[PDB]
């Protein structure tokens, strides 16, 4: 017998181990592999996909499809705000439940840039210019078109190109940010304002709707695996 000294951790069961083990079914001939379309290799290929964000998850609308409809209309004043939510993709009632959000909730650390796409869904006769802006954490949250504009932004004119892509760049003191809401790892603020009120001709709808999609850029990544807080259970199903 070759002299052996067992070390701590023996006969232990570690959920995330990774050793070889005896096959209960020897020489089994597995069914040949086919070539199904759309194969996934990494959960990121998912999060790089756009999904609609329920930005207007307001007053009961989360129960309706209206949760995704951003309200916009002709106003008798400039600078009015359109909407705003914090760059907290992981634990934010708005984001957390998207494709990007869902994936994030299976981890604990995240890093990367984000793409917010906006699609104007008003009559082709309607016009207007908007100011989409991201203000890093530090000062308060912008409450004026000014202030908001001193941040990173893009001014989107609604011409034939009805979809504008704002792009929240990664800017943090640390490499990764917690997936949960931790003020140490605050993410900043995302706001949108009227650059030039919605102008419409006669017999054309004044109020329209804007849709918003979230997705990660090619520099996005995640770490630390964990169960989602989103799915519970009381007894075994049947």
């Amino acid at each position: 017998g070759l002299p052996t000294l067992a070390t701590p951790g023996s006969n232990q069961f570690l959920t995330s181990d990774d050793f070889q083990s005896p096959s209960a079914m020897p020489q089994f001939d597995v069914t040949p592999e086919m070539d199904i379309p759309g194969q996934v290799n990494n959960l990121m290929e998912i999060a790089e996909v756009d999904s609609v964000v329920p930005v207007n998850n307001t007053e009961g609308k989360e129960m309706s499809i209206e949760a995704y409809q951003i309200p916009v209309q002709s106003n008798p004043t400039n600078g009015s705000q359109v909407f705003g939510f914090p760059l907290t993709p992981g634990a934010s009632s708005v984001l957390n439940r998207t494709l990007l959000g869902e994936i994030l909730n299976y981890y604990a650390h995240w890093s990367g840039s984000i793409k917010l796409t906006f699609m104007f869904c008003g009559s082709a006769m309607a016009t207007g210019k908007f100011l989409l802006a991201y203000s890093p954490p530090g000062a308060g949250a912008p409450t004026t078109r000014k202030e908001a504009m001193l941040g990173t932004h893009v001014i989107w004119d609604v011409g034939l190109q009805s979809s504008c892509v704002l792009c929240i760049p990664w800017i943090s003191q640390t490499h990764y940010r917690y997936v949960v809401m931790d003020e140490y790892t605050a993410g900043g603020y995302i706001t949108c304002w009227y650059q030039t009120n919605i102008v419409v001709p006669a017999d054309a709808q004044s109020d329209c709707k804007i849709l918003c999609f979230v997705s990660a850029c090619n520099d996005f990544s995640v770490r630390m695996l964990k169960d989602t807080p989103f799915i519970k259970q009381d007894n075994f199903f049947q």
């Binding site: 959920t15 003020e183 790892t185 605050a186 989602t228």
Partner: protein
């Protein structure tokens, strides 16, 4: 390895190896060869045991808890928020450096004790436990049997009493390029609220529980957690902790004397 001694003879010069200006902040590179005659001594002594790696690389208890095999209402499992400041020993060691970076070797020592009753006919089977780690944000357990113990993603360890203590390895899970041992800052940008290391602190909880009740007789198990840094990196040395510790979430202390006193500034009979 250490430096060996150089042979020294008598001198007569304007060279002042004996005098400098400490006000410089530079420490003197004065050896005994200066200020006195010396023989030659080939010194073999090695500093091998004082390497940062070796100073830290030794398992140390950082905490421990309890839980019963029985109790109605669930409520018979324990948890502990990972952190290394509830124990005096190791904290002081880690706090001899401002920033550090290292992997961790987790070792658990689980034991069970049986308490007095009236219960009879007890022939208790082996006890099997479950330690489950829950990264921050993950769904936490409520009762000794809430669904979350499935650990479909959260890693955990199952262990049967009587065997070698459980053990795992953890990579450098820090967010920044290193662990911070101190933080002269706040959590919010308006200096309101939490001040101290307590803000960087956020590494999830650890959940323990009996898998099987064993017998109807009352039992109480205790789990001891042991850390052991590996592959270490340390930056910016600090004065060891002088005052005793008072809180786990901050530097708070009550003023302490620099050392102990003696009778005269001349007493060799030290305290």
């Amino acid at each position: 390895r250490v430096a060996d001694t150089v042979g020294s003879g008598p001198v007569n010069s304007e060279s002042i190896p004996a005098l400098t200006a400490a006000e410089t902040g530079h420490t003197s590179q004065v050896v005994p060869s200066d200020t006195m005659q010396t023989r030659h001594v080939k010194n073999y002594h090695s500093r091998s045991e004082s390497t940062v790696e070796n100073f830290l690389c030794r398992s140390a208890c950082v905490f421990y808890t309890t839980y019963k095999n029985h109790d109605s209402d669930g409520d018979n499992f324990a948890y502990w928020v990972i952190n290394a400041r509830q124990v005096a020993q190791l904290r002081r060691k880690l706090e001899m450096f401002t920033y550090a970076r290292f992997d961790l070797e987790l070792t658990f020592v689980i034991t069970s004790t049986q308490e007095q009753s009236t219960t009879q006919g007890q022939d208790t089977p082996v006890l099997t436990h479950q330690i489950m780690y829950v990264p921050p944000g993950g769904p936490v357990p409520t009762k000794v049997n809430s669904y979350s113990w499935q650990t479909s993603t959260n890693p955990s360890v199952f262990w049967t009493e009587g065997n070698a203590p459980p053990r795992m390895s953890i990579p450098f899970i820090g967010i920044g390029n290193a662990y911070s041992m101190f933080y002269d800052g706040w959590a919010r940008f308006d200096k309101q609220g939490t001040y101290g290391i307590s803000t960087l602190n956020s590494m999830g909880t650890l959940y323990m529980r009996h898998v099987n009740g064993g017998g109807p007789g009352p039992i109480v198990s205790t789990v001891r957690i042991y850390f052991k840094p590996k592959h270490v990196k340390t930056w910016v040395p600090r004065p060891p902790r002088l005052c005793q510790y008072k809180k786990a979430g901050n530097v708070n202390f009550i003023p302490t004397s620099v050392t102990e006193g003696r009778t005269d500034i001349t007493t060799m009979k030290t305290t």
